[PDB]
Design a protein around this ligand. Sequence first.
Ligand SMILES: NC(=O)c1ccc[n+]([C@@H]2O[C@H](COP(=O)([O-])OP(=O)(O)OC[C@H]3O[C@@H](n4cnc5c(N)ncnc54)[C@H](OP(=O)(O)O)[C@@H]3O)[C@@H](O)[C@H]2O)c1
Ligand SMILES: Cc1ccc(S(=O)(=O)NC(=O)NN2C[C@H]3CCC[C@H]3C2)cc1
Length: 315
Amino acid sequence: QCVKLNDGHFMPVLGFGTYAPPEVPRSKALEVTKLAIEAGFRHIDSAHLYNNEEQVGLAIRSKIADGSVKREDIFYTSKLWSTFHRPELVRPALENSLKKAQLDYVDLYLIHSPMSLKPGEELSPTDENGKVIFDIVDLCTTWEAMEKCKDAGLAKSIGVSNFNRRQLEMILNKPGLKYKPVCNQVECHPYFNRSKLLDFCKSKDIVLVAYSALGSQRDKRWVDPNSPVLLEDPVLCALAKKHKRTPALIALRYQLQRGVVVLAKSYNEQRIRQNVQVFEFQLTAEDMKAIDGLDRNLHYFNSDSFASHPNYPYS
Ligand SMILES: NC(=O)c1ccc[n+]([C@@H]2O[C@H](COP(=O)([O-])OP(=O)(O)OC[C@H]3O[C@@H](n4cnc5c(N)ncnc54)[C@H](OP(=O)(O)O)[C@@H]3O)[C@@H](O)[C@H]2O)c1
Ligand SMILES: Cc1ccc(S(=O)(=O)NC(=O)NN2C[C@H]3CCC[C@H]3C2)cc1
């Protein structure tokens, strides 16, 4: 159950989301990554930002050592954080991710976000009035350094995340482009279905990878507590009743049938195992149209500061 990427590599269509907020002890990521692998997940999404690559990498080594999987059975994604966009910083950022995880390579490396931040050791650099410090970087140069990570064998595939159409075209029209982005990992769910971006991506052989596909973790630091709770949506619950599944399963299946590769974060053993049942049933064309009607241009992530950034993707 994979999709063929535009560089000839294969991505599993269901991915495991690994981010958990800092109140969750770091040992949990180790435990639940093992559980996801045990359940059947093979595509695993992490990032430098998530402060978990060591734990996720150790789960993977653990499941290889005990004979459940081989390295080449696992599709592992990491991401370049926005403080490392300057081209000279890209390779060392990846090498550090690889060292942490103890892998020789990632299956996929992404530019996490187009919103460049000031180089340094803070993930979130701020000035003397507490304002986040943006950086200005030609992302075409970042991308060239990404291509070099691929040729260097350190990333089998390269792509982007949180790019809008204009940003994607800037890469696609770059003079001397060697590798297209294989994907664009973006927020995508029935309340924000991205159909326009998705059709653009499809026209360019670029895979759209959905995050917050289950409505996000509703973290009080970035998500308005008054936003509607996706999985309480009454169309989603009535489809769940109809198919005898769950609303999460409806949300995940929706993405698969529209050609979207979908991530699903759970740190709960039974929900982890539930999510792999997405492959067991199908929505009707009329179900899919019903879900398509739910879009409300709702993005769960908000930060007013990021909105002023010149590369803010929702400009
Ligand atoms: N590129 C980016 O900028 C970006 C941004 C955000 C996320 N991501 C990636 O995408 C992953 C997923 O997105 P997300 O973290 O926003 O979460 P999500 O996949 O939208 O899931 C949100 C919540 O749904 C719950 N859930 C999972 N399965 C369930 C089921 N079957 N029934 C009921 N509830 C269920 C989980 O809680 P429990 O843990 O309690 O089950 C989870 O906290 C992330 O972990 C990360 O890998 C990338
Ligand atoms: C510190 C922290 C913040 C947020 C999250 S998270 O929001 O749960 N997950 C995620 O990957 N990153 N964010 C979405 C992107 C758009 C803007 C910049 C990026 C940040 C995890 C960890």
